[PDB]
């Protein structure tokens, strides 16, 4: 069946997202400063709105000290502009205060009417630097806390790095029932699965090898079902997509054409950045964008490629082109129609129907 | 002569600010909650939205942890459906990571074309307590940050609390030029002068005796005076104006008509109380402040008392209001058709000289975007 049991097992569908592309993430050709794509509120928005106006079902939104638009700003910024998507809020854990950081969850939350997923990421913060170690314990201790916001009456956790005793939730009570919002976040360390198993709700992968995807699904299950638990799985990968594959190769090697790589060149060239799979080109991480790898073939070999993935389990895919405006529309126009669609959290059953008896919502004011 | 010198002396106006009341802080009958009234985004926006219709200059958003929008959230709310209006922000130091939060601000600025205030208030974190010494010290170092940020090419601070050694400020460049957004906060406490002295680019204060605030506006001018700055000064007060005085005094006592007090009162055991909670002044109601409202009492009158006493406390060299009533809604609705349009009004960043007219040559606006 699915390479291990998944928690969306019976759906016959998968929720494709795009990219906001927040940290001046945009560009014609990579390498290359393009001002019509600064990571803007215009522009950023602009995604958002084209993603949405497209039937993408998630968009994920990054966090990081570079150039570009704040992660939950820009999300409440989009908030009132947006109808249907989902939002993948990027929250690095200890940066907002725990107690503010449930709090701000729960703000959006409802305004957005449950259209919301945080997205955990455990990094150091911007100009400071603290060992995995402590940065895990840390995002640890803060999931916790979102949980008990979301669950409980008052929060009561006892933890090396943080302490409260006895904090109304009311404040903080999210839209979204049943546990709360849905959580994507991935790790490939022991210290980020344990933390995925404990915690994930979702949990990411960066593109690989059909079979080393296998491996990292395993793994990361045996850590969920020693918290009796079982995760739902996805993947974060770039693309490149057209009528004909002869087109996307050609685009592709247009969009590294003017990196001045280790490769712009006694030239014994290793070029381990080529075709690692049928559709899967490596050639896009010689402009390390985080995502080294993108889907790259006519519409019917993506839409295949995305069709066995789904085989397989992964549920969700995260996708971003170049640029991250006209990608969308392709992939769009294209591959998006053709698929079965949903909204994890509407699936998984967290968000009501009618506005629900919240503190900011219907609930009786105290 | 103003009491004091200000910052904005030959200014012949002042920014009449409103309130979006986003700490469950908006009533009918104080001591009543009122479900119509939730301190949620539509309601809460709907305040900026009308505010702004009334050509309300700026509006306080405040931020504790009580029922209601986080500040910074509603301020990016609010930012796409805005034009005219300046927001006030509240924002404890320390709550956000300071060179996130000095982003953060950036983004909104943007967000906003320069329509931003900070204001900084230095409190206790929620389900924390930490001693006032250090929550200032605190609250020093982050504005010391910001203002980096919004000066110098890189952040390097080495305090007590925080330190960052050279740190790129390209991520966090505002909108706002010299010396970036204003700050509007106030304090009594000499810790809280300190700060309003080396910092405030406006000093707010609570209501008081028209005599009263000139010697809060002197103890805090002398120490902005010790750092060589001129502070702007604002007043935070509460509004009930009407057409004729006997029905501001109506609402007023109907405000209060349900609040359980020890004033809620045959052995005639009687006490006054009134002595505490009447008119310290012609039109300045202290009664209010049976609610334990932070702010703890009103300006009642009719439209032309109001609009006397505002010219009064504008003579002192208050250039800043931060009005507020009950409901907020209609409150705002009486002050904006009665006294707002008789009034010379401005924006302070605008006047002070920080809002560029064309989008400036910014990482997030017009600047040349450099790898990464």
């Given amino acids: 069946m699915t390479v291990v049991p998944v928690t969306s097992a019976d759906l016959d569908a998968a929720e494709v997202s795009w ?13 290359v400063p393009d001002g019509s794509l600064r990571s803007s509120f215009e522009h950023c928005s602009d995604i958002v709105k084209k993603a949405e106006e497209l039937g993408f079902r998630n968009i994920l939104c990054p966090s990081s000290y570079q150039v570009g638009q704040d992660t939950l ?26 107690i503010m950081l449930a709090r701000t969850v729960a703000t959006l939350d409802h305004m957005l009417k449950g259209r919301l997923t945080l997205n955990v990421i ?36 006892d933890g090396e790095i943080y302490q409260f005793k006895g904090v109304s939730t009311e404040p903080a009570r ?29 949990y990411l992968m960066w593109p690989e090898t059909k079979d080393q ?29 057209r009528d004909t594959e002869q087109e996307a190769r050609e685009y592709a090697d247009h969009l590294v054409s003017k990196l001045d790589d280790e490769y712009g060149q006694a030239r014994e060239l290793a070029d381990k950045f080529g075709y690692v799979e049928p559709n899967l080109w490596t050639g896009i991480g010689r402009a390390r964008s985080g995502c080294g790898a993108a889907l790259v073939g006519s519409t019917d070999q993506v839409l295949s490629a995305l069709e066995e993935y789904q085989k397989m389990g992964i549920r969700a895919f ?49």
């Fill in 19 to 31: 990219f906001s592309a927040l940290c001046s993430d945009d560009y014609a050709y990579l390498g």
């Fill in 73 to 98: 700003s820009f999300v409440a910024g989009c908030a009132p502009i947006s109808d249907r998507i989902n939002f993948l809020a990027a929250i690095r854990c200890g940066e907002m205060q725990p």
């Fill in 122 to 157: 455990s990094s150091d913060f911007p100009g400071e630097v603290a060992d995995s170690a402590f940065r895990y314990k840390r995002s640890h201790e803060v999931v916790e806390i979102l949980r008990q916001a979301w669950t409980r009456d008052t929060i009561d956790h």
């Fill in 174 to 202: 999210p839209y979204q029932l049943n546990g709360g919002p849905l959580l994507y976040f991935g790790g490939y360390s022991p210290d980020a699965l344990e933390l995925c198993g404990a915690q994930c709700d979702v």
């Fill in 213 to 241: 995807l296998a491996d990292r699904m395993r793994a990361a299950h045996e850590r969920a079902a020693a918290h009796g638990r079982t995760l739902d799985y996805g993947l974060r990968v770039h693309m490149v997509v």
């Fill in 318 to 366: 995260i996708l971003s082109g170049y640029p991250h405006l006209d990608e969308a529309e392709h992939f769009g126009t294209k591959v998006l129609p053709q698929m079965k669609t949903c909204s994890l959290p509407h699936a998984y059953g967290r968000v009501p129907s009618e506005t629900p008896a919240t503190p900011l919502g219907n609930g009786e004011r105290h």
